[PDB]
Design a protein around this ligand. Structure first.
Ligand code: MG
Ligand code: MG
Ligand code: MG
Ligand code: MG
Ligand code: MG
Ligand code: MG
Ligand code: MG
Ligand code: MG
Ligand code: MG
Ligand code: MG
Ligand code: MG
Ligand code: MG
Ligand code: MG
Ligand code: MG
Ligand code: MG
Ligand code: MG
Ligand code: MG
Ligand code: MG
Ligand code: MG
Ligand code: MG
Ligand code: MG
Ligand code: MG
Ligand code: MG
Ligand code: MG
Ligand code: MG
Lengths: 104, 168, 95, 385
RNA sequence: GAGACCGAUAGCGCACAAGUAGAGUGAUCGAAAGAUGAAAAGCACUUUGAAAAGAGGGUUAAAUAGCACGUGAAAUUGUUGA
RNA sequence: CGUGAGCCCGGGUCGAACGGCCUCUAGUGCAGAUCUUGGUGGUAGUAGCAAAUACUUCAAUGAGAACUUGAAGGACCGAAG
RNA sequence: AUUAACGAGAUUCCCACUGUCCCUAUCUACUAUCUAGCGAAACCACAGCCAAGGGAACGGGCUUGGCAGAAUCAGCGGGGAA
């Protein structure tokens, strides 16, 4: 069904040891992998603003924690119509520490 | 157009010829050998999973220096691969053959891939440039892929007579 | 659509490089029909094609250092790399 | 000499082939000689490596330099929850070796045992030993009685089927490690009644081993993967001018024999080998219920054996444990086999009666300086928390 | 005008848009390449495919002659059978 | 069938010429010559496709998009570029 | 014959310095590695387990023994008088 939740991704433990010039590209991949493990949808779109947030400090500097809003939606016509797709947005919070999972 | 079977009557079967396809012959021969003898629906689904790396084509004859996989345990081999280009061409032929069967009125649900072979095609010419000013060939290995869908002595005689009489 | 010739035409009309040309992403269908320079400059007046401002290169940090140099700051032996004759020739001093 | 300057061989020929062990649980290749005068007793046990720590004790060795001085020495902590006995195996002696004649299983086997018999326990029907329990029930268990009579009359070696309680350890594994332990001791009749009475009854490490016993520890060493010649065999590194690689053996054989020999160092697998480390003295057999497991008669602090912040990558210890001197093969969380010594000890060091003086409980996650949270609070005063 | 000549790796380098294409600064060097069918009658139309094509269907004495075209060996390869 | 080089017949494909016997004639018999020309293998789906720092998100086009296009972000050349 | 200055010239010693070494260990990037696509070449009598004997006097084949169980992946540099 359609459900939206706010998530905190402890991105620091996913980027541990990752080669520089690959950290920011892998952060996009790990967000897609994170969205799949949460909402069970293989089709994950990422908001362009969240792309800016990940790429904010260059390719090596990625935030230790990211507060995102994963919203599982319904595919209308494109491709497999009955499928569900997940849309990940960015939560504009300056204190991503100390938050739990919140259903929106 | 003549197929290698010539014993399958083209009245209760479906065919798709396929010719001069620029896909690896070695990869397509191994992909077709897995499909050989399967149900049409199973074979179509199997090739769909190969495209998504869900299940793998076992490499048996042309498997020198390749790598192992755990998805080769289904066929009992150690070496397996996922020839996406070969499986994508074969899906076009299976779809074409199934289309012909439907036009002829054949029952699609009980079709079986009974004959499928892959023959080599005339190679294509390209060059590669090596050290010290040498030039070597850079050859493609295309193929043709045809496919058919179906669903006493006197003493012995005297002994036999005695045997019948004596036996109860 | 392909708009490589649109940024080339817009760059020449506006007098700047192709890196400073902005074509509206929501109007690419109508921009793609701008095959002539007269049509390109019509879009500029309409507002679909916009010249981006130059990237800022501020100098005040250099000005602050020069002002501090005037009052004697950042002048010690640890900030001198050339010889005294290179920093102030005696030929000029005598002159 | 045709070998200009000669040196001893690199490596041991007695540990080949240096390949991955065919097992993950250490195997008791041989059990002690089974004197028939001593009372019946088990000879082996299984625990899990928790980690290492250091102790201080007063040495006692007349004639040594440190005859009555304090020595700092490392020990290994093995977590040993009590084992359950679930079976009895009889062995007969044949001109082809020892042969397992029959096996007797007690009823009511726990799921920890039953998981050892599946690879996909989660989706199975768990039918293991479902039809077997009828042997204990039907005919007043006459089927089991016949098998017990067979073991007494025929078999000359009796073993129990052991069972770990991995659910009591801080490991994500739910499969229990099953084992055969030989009942060394009296007559064959005594061994069967000893093993039969032990069915489904937990056996603590306290009974098997004593405080000052010298034991052997059997485990699979730490794996290193595919490693080169210098790491596997410790050969001399080649000069830095070498063209095609430095960490290699230069001559891998003469012209004749025209073969690469088995005695020449080659790259391959290192670690994950089965090893039997012998002559390890026990220092303490702690209790899982006591709140002062690390407390001695000199250091009277009521502190447990778990260091501050827990053992690194293992967890806490809430069961019985064995403190063994020195290091042992394997890694943390690895199941390890403890076996009684097969030798006779006459050295003063082996016969030495140890008495601990202090046990370190500072954190191993860093340069920990405090042995208990209470001591940390008095030294540091009050914080912002 | 002829031949006890050669017959497409032969006979002139050239049976063909051959001293051509191509190589070399240049002097010069210099190939490969013949054959559907009596007649294009060179596959209308339907269907699957994005398309190349495939399957039906039709031309022909023959497509086991489809312009990759007289016959179609071997090396080498695929399927089936033993 | 013949000791043999070879000859003959049956079955399949093919479509325009061919053979025996007696003499005459020769550019007349191949396993090799690092033989000549053309074609084809194993090796082998192998070696490999690793210098010049680096790409990511959305949308459109399209049967199909890492290397098409627009927007956004991140970078490089750094005026002897 | 001797020579100040000069020398990517040859040689010896001393100071400093350092993984050259005692004696190795560890880290990073790109490969190697696995996958999708693409895809060669050298070489090739036939092939590919040894010991001894004899032999053109150092055998993969012979003789007498030892033995010997499908198919494979990553390394390796003894042999193939490669
Ligand atoms: Mg690392
Ligand atoms: Mg390889
Ligand atoms: Mg090999
Ligand atoms: Mg060149
Ligand atoms: Mg002057
Ligand atoms: Mg020597
Ligand atoms: Mg060198
Ligand atoms: Mg004909
Ligand atoms: Mg014909
Ligand atoms: Mg032909
Ligand atoms: Mg043939
Ligand atoms: Mg004719
Ligand atoms: Mg001749
Ligand atoms: Mg000839
Ligand atoms: Mg020949
Ligand atoms: Mg030759
Ligand atoms: Mg490769
Ligand atoms: Mg390279
Ligand atoms: Mg200049
Ligand atoms: Mg030999
Ligand atoms: Mg030889
Ligand atoms: Mg002989
Ligand atoms: Mg022999
Ligand atoms: Mg060699
Ligand atoms: Mg090598």
């Amino acid at each position: 069904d359609v459900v939206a939740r706010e998530y905190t991704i402890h991105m620091h433990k996913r980027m541990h040891g990752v080669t520089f010039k690959k950290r920011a590209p892998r952060a996009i991949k790990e967000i897609k992998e994170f969205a799949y493990k949460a909402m069970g949808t293989t089709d994950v779109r990422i908001d362009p603003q969240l792309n800016k947030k990940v790429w904010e400090q260059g390719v090596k500097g990625v935030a230790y924690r990211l507060r995102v809003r994963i919203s599982r939606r319904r595919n209308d016509e494109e491709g497999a119509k009955e499928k569900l797709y997940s849309y990940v947005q960015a939560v504009n919070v300056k204190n991503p520490k100390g938050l739990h999972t919140v259903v929106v | 157009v003549r197929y290698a079977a010539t014993e399958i009557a083209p009245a209760k079967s479906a065919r798709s010829r396929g010719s001069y396809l620029r896909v690896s012959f070695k990869n397509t021969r191994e992909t077709a050998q897995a499909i050989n003898g399967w149900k049409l629906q199973r074979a179509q689904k199997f090739l769909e999973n190969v495209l998504e790396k869900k299940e793998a084509v076992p490499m048996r004859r042309y498997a020198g220096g390749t790598g192992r996989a755990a998805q080769g345990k289904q066929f009992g081999v150690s070496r397996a691969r996922w020839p996406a280009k070969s499986a994508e061409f074969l899906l076009g032929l299976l779809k074409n053959a199934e289309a012909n069967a439907d036009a002829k009125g054949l029952d699609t649900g009980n079709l079986v891939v009974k004959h499928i072979q892959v023959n080599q095609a005339p190679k294509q010419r390209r060059r590669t440039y090596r050290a010290h000013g040498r030039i070597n060939p850079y050859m493609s290995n295309p193929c043709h892929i045809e496919l058919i869908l179906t669903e006493l002595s006197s003493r012995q005689r005297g002994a036999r007579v005695r045997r019948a009489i004596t036996a109860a | 659509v392909n708009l490589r010739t649109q940024k080339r035409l817009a760059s020449s009309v506006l007098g700047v490089g192709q890196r400073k040309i902005w074509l509206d992403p929501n109007e690419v269908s109508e921009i793609s029909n701008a095959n002539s320079r007269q049509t390109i400059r019509k879009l500029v007046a309409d507002g679909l094609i916009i010249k981006k401002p130059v990237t800022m290169h501020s100098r005040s940090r250099a000005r602050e250092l020069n002002l501090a140099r005037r009052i004697g700051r950042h002048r010690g032996f640890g900030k001198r790399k050339g010889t005294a004759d290179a920093r102030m020739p005696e030929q000029v001093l005598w002159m | 000499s045709h070998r200009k300057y000669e040196a001893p061989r690199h490596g041991s020929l007695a540990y080949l082939p240096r390949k991955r062990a065919a097992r993950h649980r250490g195997k008791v290749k041989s059990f002690p000689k089974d004197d028939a005068k001593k009372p019946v007793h088990l000879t082996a046990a299984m625990g899990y490596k928790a980690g290492m720590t250091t102790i201080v004790r007063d040495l006692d060795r007349p004639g040594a330099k440190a005859h009555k001085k304090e020595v700092v020495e490392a020990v290994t902590i093995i977590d040993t929850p009590p084992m359950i006995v679930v079976g009895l195996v009889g062995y007969i002696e044949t001109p082809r070796g020892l042969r397992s004649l029959t096996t007797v299983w007690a009823e009511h086997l726990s799921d920890e045992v039953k998981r050892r018999f599946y690879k996909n326990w989660y989706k199975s029907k768990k039918k293991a030993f479902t039809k077997y329990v009828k042997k204990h029930s039907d005919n007043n268990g006459a089927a089991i009685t016949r098998e017990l009579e067979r073991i007494k009359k025929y078999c000359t070696v009796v073993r129990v089927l052991a069972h770990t309680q991995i659910r009591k350890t801080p490991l994500k594994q739910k499969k229990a490690h099953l084992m055969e332990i030989q009942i060394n001791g009296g007559s064959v009749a005594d061994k069967v009644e000893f093993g039969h009475g032990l069915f489904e009854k937990p056996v603590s490490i306290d009974s098997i081993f004593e405080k000052d016993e010298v034991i052997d520890v059997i485990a699979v060493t730490k794996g290193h993967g595919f490693t080169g010649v210098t790491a596997r065999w410790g050969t001399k590194k080649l000069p830095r001018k070498t063209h095609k690689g430095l960490r290699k053996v230069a001559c891998i054989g003469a012209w004749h024999p025209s073969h690469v020999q088995w005695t020449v160092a080659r790259a391959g697998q290192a670690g994950y080998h089965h090893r039997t480390s012998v002559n390890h003295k026990i220092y303490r057999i702690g209790k899982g219920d006591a709140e002062d497991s690390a407390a001695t008669e000199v250091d009277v602090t009521k502190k447990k054996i778990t260091p501050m912040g827990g053992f690194v990558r293992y967890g806490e210890i809430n069961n019985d444990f064995v403190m063994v001197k020195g290091s042992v093969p394997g890694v943390k969380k690895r199941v390890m086999t403890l076996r009684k010594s097969m030798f006779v000890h006459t050295s003063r060091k082996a016969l030495e009666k140890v008495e601990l003086k202090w046990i370190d409980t500072s954190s191993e996650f860093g340069h920990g300086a405090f042995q208990t949270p209470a001591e940390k609070k008095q030294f540091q005063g009050t914080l912002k928390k």
